[PDB]
Design an enzyme around this catalytic site. Structure first.
Site, mmCIF file in Angstrom:
data_model
loop_
_atom_site.group_PDB
_atom_site.id
_atom_site.type_symbol
_atom_site.label_atom_id
_atom_site.label_comp_id
_atom_site.label_asym_id
_atom_site.label_seq_id
_atom_site.Cartn_x
_atom_site.Cartn_y
_atom_site.Cartn_z
ATOM 1 N N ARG A 34 -28.839 -70.643 -7.437
ATOM 2 C CA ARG A 34 -27.234 -72.270 -7.811
ATOM 3 C C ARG A 34 -28.192 -72.211 -8.366
ATOM 4 O O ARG A 34 -29.173 -73.593 -7.874
ATOM 5 C CB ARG A 34 -26.916 -72.068 -6.282
ATOM 6 C CG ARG A 34 -25.426 -72.482 -6.470
ATOM 7 C CD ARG A 34 -24.701 -73.254 -5.861
ATOM 8 N NE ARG A 34 -23.521 -72.153 -5.403
ATOM 9 C CZ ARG A 34 -23.621 -71.454 -4.018
ATOM 10 N NH1 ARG A 34 -24.522 -71.665 -3.122
ATOM 11 N NH2 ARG A 34 -22.738 -70.812 -4.037
ATOM 12 N N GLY A 38 -23.601 -73.024 -12.541
ATOM 13 C CA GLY A 38 -23.187 -71.603 -12.124
ATOM 14 C C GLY A 38 -24.234 -71.385 -10.920
ATOM 15 O O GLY A 38 -25.485 -71.833 -10.579
ATOM 16 N N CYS A 39 -23.958 -69.886 -10.076
ATOM 17 C CA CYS A 39 -24.538 -68.886 -8.962
ATOM 18 C C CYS A 39 -24.866 -67.722 -9.616
ATOM 19 O O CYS A 39 -24.131 -66.991 -10.171
ATOM 20 C CB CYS A 39 -23.921 -69.777 -7.941
ATOM 21 S SG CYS A 39 -22.269 -69.480 -7.334
ATOM 22 N N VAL A 40 -24.983 -66.972 -8.539
ATOM 23 C CA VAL A 40 -25.263 -65.647 -8.860
ATOM 24 C C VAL A 40 -25.832 -65.167 -7.509
ATOM 25 O O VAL A 40 -26.894 -65.550 -6.001
ATOM 26 C CB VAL A 40 -26.965 -65.339 -9.216
ATOM 27 C CG1 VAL A 40 -27.679 -63.778 -9.353
ATOM 28 C CG2 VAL A 40 -26.920 -66.026 -10.498
ATOM 29 N N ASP A 145 -33.510 -68.484 -26.660
ATOM 30 C CA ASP A 145 -34.156 -69.303 -25.123
ATOM 31 C C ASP A 145 -35.666 -68.345 -25.313
ATOM 32 O O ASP A 145 -35.756 -68.168 -23.642
ATOM 33 C CB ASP A 145 -32.854 -69.072 -24.651
ATOM 34 C CG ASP A 145 -34.305 -70.709 -23.461
ATOM 35 O OD1 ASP A 145 -35.337 -70.677 -23.469
ATOM 36 O OD2 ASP A 145 -33.384 -70.702 -22.439
ATOM 37 N N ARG A 149 -39.325 -66.896 -17.922
ATOM 38 C CA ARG A 149 -38.187 -67.756 -17.103
ATOM 39 C C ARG A 149 -36.550 -66.779 -17.096
ATOM 40 O O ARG A 149 -35.762 -66.634 -16.314
ATOM 41 C CB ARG A 149 -38.426 -68.770 -16.862
ATOM 42 C CG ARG A 149 -37.558 -69.803 -18.191
ATOM 43 C CD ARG A 149 -36.850 -70.900 -18.435
ATOM 44 N NE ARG A 149 -36.936 -70.941 -20.005
ATOM 45 C CZ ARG A 149 -37.856 -71.862 -20.449
ATOM 46 N NH1 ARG A 149 -38.734 -72.695 -20.457
ATOM 47 N NH2 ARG A 149 -37.444 -72.046 -21.881
ATOM 48 N N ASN A 150 -36.514 -66.268 -18.336
ATOM 49 C CA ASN A 150 -35.667 -65.446 -19.022
ATOM 50 C C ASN A 150 -35.517 -64.096 -19.220
ATOM 51 O O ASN A 150 -34.496 -63.193 -19.321
ATOM 52 C CB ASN A 150 -35.298 -66.578 -20.242
ATOM 53 C CG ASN A 150 -34.154 -66.664 -19.794
ATOM 54 O OD1 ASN A 150 -33.677 -67.286 -18.647
ATOM 55 N ND2 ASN A 150 -34.076 -67.979 -20.924
ATOM 56 N N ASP A 163 -30.448 -63.506 -20.865
ATOM 57 C CA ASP A 163 -31.109 -65.567 -20.582
ATOM 58 C C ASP A 163 -29.773 -65.993 -19.979
ATOM 59 O O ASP A 163 -29.331 -65.657 -19.479
ATOM 60 C CB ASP A 163 -30.250 -65.648 -22.029
ATOM 61 C CG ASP A 163 -29.897 -67.280 -22.405
ATOM 62 O OD1 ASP A 163 -30.465 -67.935 -21.696
ATOM 63 O OD2 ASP A 163 -29.739 -67.668 -23.398
#
Ligand SMILES: COc1cc2c(Oc3ccc(NC(=O)C4(C(=O)Nc5ccc(F)cc5)CC4)cc3F)ccnc2cc1OCCCN1CCOCC1
Length: 278
Positions: A34, A38-40, A145, A149-150, A163
């Site tokens: 989170r 946003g969150c997952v 981007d 990390r993506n 992304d």
């Protein structure tokens, strides 16, 4: 949400990829990550015969932020390539449903001390990324981007270019919010982006792979990276990085966008490098 208060173009698109709320079990205590906006969550997607698919479920924490959120999902809708993250669908916060990526992001994966990816494995991930980018570039899509990390990594160690968008946790790398140390010289000077600027990002990503997730230019402050590059300075060759792979990185960072290699050339050359490893 009030559907009426969003563009009908975004609305009909989101309806072509809709997932009925009764097909999707979201596990709300089961937070994957989170960030601020946003969150997952872990999710389960049921098909019409009852078979369970483990998925990630991305959500808004909170009209503008909702329209952006939905647009981020819709962009993905037609990417179909094994090295690009795909959308399972969208559930009307609205929920963007993604396949589950067992190993999380590539940067965290390669930094994990309990696993030893070999120099070959790391070059291998770079190649997978080049293949995802070759596809995106064929569709004239500009990523803007690209960074370790993506990129996500599934249960088969397949890399998926993606992304996080609004679900970014890791935010120090942005300073428009700009991933300056992955940015091409001309994007830094103009804030404009192209496929050739994704190529620059790609070379930095390869350097991340070869250093197992070291932060680039760690003694350079966000804003100072422009004059650093203009002085004729680049990232140093990592200790285990083969000379031809470092030559690849340097070509990615050429000051003239048009002299940078294409993703097609990157795929062919990095395939040759990768094949030389026992
Ligand atoms: C933080 O950890 C995780 C995040 C995950 C995940 O996150 C997302 C990634 C991308 C998007 N994309 C997007 O929201 C969008 C995007 O991807 N668009 C896009 C853009 C360009 C492109 F080329 C392709 C797609 C914005 C729409 C959305 C997400 F929610 C999706 C699927 N599985 C995941 C598994 C994770 O960990 C599992 C636990 C792993 N462990 C490791 C070892 O320690 C234990 C924990």
């Amino acid at each position: 949400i009030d559907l009426s208060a969003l563009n009908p173009e975004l609305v009909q698109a989101v309806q072509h990829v809709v997932i009925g709320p009764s097909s999707l079990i979201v596990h709300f205590n089961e937070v994957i990550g989170r960030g601020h906006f946003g969150c997952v969550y872990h999710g389960t997607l049921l098909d019409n015969d009852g078979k369970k698919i483990h998925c990630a479920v991305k959500s808004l924490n909170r009209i503008g932020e909702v329209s952006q959120f939905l647009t981020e999902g819709i962009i993905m809708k037609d990417f179909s390539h094994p090295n690009v993250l795909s959308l399972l669908g969208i559930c009307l916060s609205p929920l963007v449903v993604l396949p589950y990526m067992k190993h999380g992001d590539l940067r965290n994966f390669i930094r994990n001390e309990t696993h030893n990816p070999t120099v070959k494995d790391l070059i291998g991930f770079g190649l997978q990324v080049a293949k995802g980018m070759k596809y995106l570039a064929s569709k004239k899509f500009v990523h803007r981007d690209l960074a370790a990390r993506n990129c996500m990594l599934d249960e088969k160690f397949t890399v998926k270019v993606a992304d996080f968008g609004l679900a970014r946790d890791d935010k120090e790398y942005y300073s428009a919010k700009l991933p300056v140390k992955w940015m091409a010289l001309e994007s830094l000077q103009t804030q404009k982006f192209t496929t050739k600027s994704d190529v620059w990002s790609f070379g930095v990503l390869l350097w991340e792979l070869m250093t197992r997730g070291a932060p680039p230019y760690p003694d350079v402050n966000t804003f100072d990276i422009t004059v650093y590059l203009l002085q004729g300075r680049r990232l140093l060759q990592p200790e285990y990085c083969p000379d031809p792979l470092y030559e690849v990185m340097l070509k990615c960072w050429h000051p003239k966008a048009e002299m940078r290699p294409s993703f097609s050339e990157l795929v062919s050359r990095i395939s040759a490098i990768f094949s030389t490893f026992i």
